[PDB]
C-alpha cells in the first residue's frame, strides 16, 4: 500500500531534486558542518545506494545529508535500509523525520529511526523528542530504555517507525524495538504532536566534535578514520490497511 519510495537506481548521479533537498548550515551539532559544503560534493547516487559522506576537505569539516521536500501523515510506516561503510570516531549518522510547518523545535516533534555515537559503538539509538519531554533548552529525548547493545551498524539493516494518532513504534530488521504513546492530555502540553503536521525524511552523515568550544555527543573527531559514507540502499513509506 506504498505511499512513496526511492531505491536510488535512477537515470541520475544525485538524489532526485524533485523530492530531495540538501541539508544546510545551522548553529547546532548535526547542522554545523553543512556551512561550506559545495553543492552535492558529499551526496551521490551510484550502484543503487544514496551515498552520504563525511570528510575534512582542506582544514574544514564537511557533512553529507539530504531531506525530503514532501512530508507524510500519521497511518504510515517509514523504512530505510542502510549501512555505514565504517565506524568513524566523531561520526554522527542519522535517519530521522521532522515536522513541516511546526512551531519552533522541539514543540511539533522529532522522530529518530537511527543514530550512532562512537561512545556506544555496538548500538544505535531510536529516540523521540517533544516539548513535553525535553524542555525547550533540553534535548535529551526518550530512547529505547532496553535496546540492542551488540549491534553492527556497518551491515545493512532496515530502520523503521509507525506513527498512529495512537502512537510511535520503532523497529529494526522488522522486530519491534519499543514505542512511545499518545496519552491524550490537554493538547496544550504538546505531549504527542506527531500527527498535527506532516513528517519528512532526513538522511545524513554529520561530523560532531567541538561546538562553540563545548564537546557534543558524537564526541571527539578522529581525522585518521575519515572519510566515512552512510549508504541508504532505499527508503519506503507505506499507508497501513
Ligand atoms: C541539540 C540539537 O542539535 N538540536 C537540533 C535538532 O536535533 C538533533 C537531535 O535532537 C537528534 O538527535 O537528531 C539529529 C541527529 O544528527 C540532531 O542532532 O535538529 C533540529 C532541526 O534541525 C534543530 O532545529 C532548528 O534550529 C534552528 C536554529 O538554528 C531554527 O530556529 C528552527 O526553528 C529549528 O527547527 C535543533 O537545533
Residue numbers in the entry: 36 to 276
What do the study authors state?
Here we describe the discovery and characterisation of endo-acting glycoside hydrolases expressed by mucin-degrading members of the HGM that are able to cleave the O-glycan chains of a range of different animal and human mucins. All of the GH16 enzymes comprise a β-jellyroll fold, characteristic of the family, consisting of two β-sheets composed of β-strands that form the core fold, which were superimposable with other GH16 structures previously published. Overall these data reveal that the nine GH16 enzymes analysed are endo acting β1,4-galactosidases that display a preference for polyLacNAc structures found in mucins and other similar glycans such as KS.
A cleft running along the concave surface of the enzymes contains the active site and where the trisaccharide product was bound in the cases of BF4060 and BACCAC_02680E143Q. BF4060 and BACCAC_02680E143Q have four fingers and BACCAC_03717 and Amuc_0724 have five out of six possible fingers that have been observed previously in other GH16 structures. BF4060 and BACCAC_02680 display 79% identity and unsurprisingly the structures of these two enzymes are almost identical in the cleft region. BF4060 (and also its close homologue BACCAC_02680) has a significant preference for TriLacNAc over milk oligosaccharides and analysis of the +1 subsite shows a narrow slot where a GlcNAc would insert with the N-acetyl pointing away from the cleft and S174 from Finger 5 would pincer the N-acetyl against finger 6, thus generating specificity for GlcNAc over glucose. BF4060, BACCAC_02680 and BACCAC_03717 also displayed some very weak activity against laminarin.
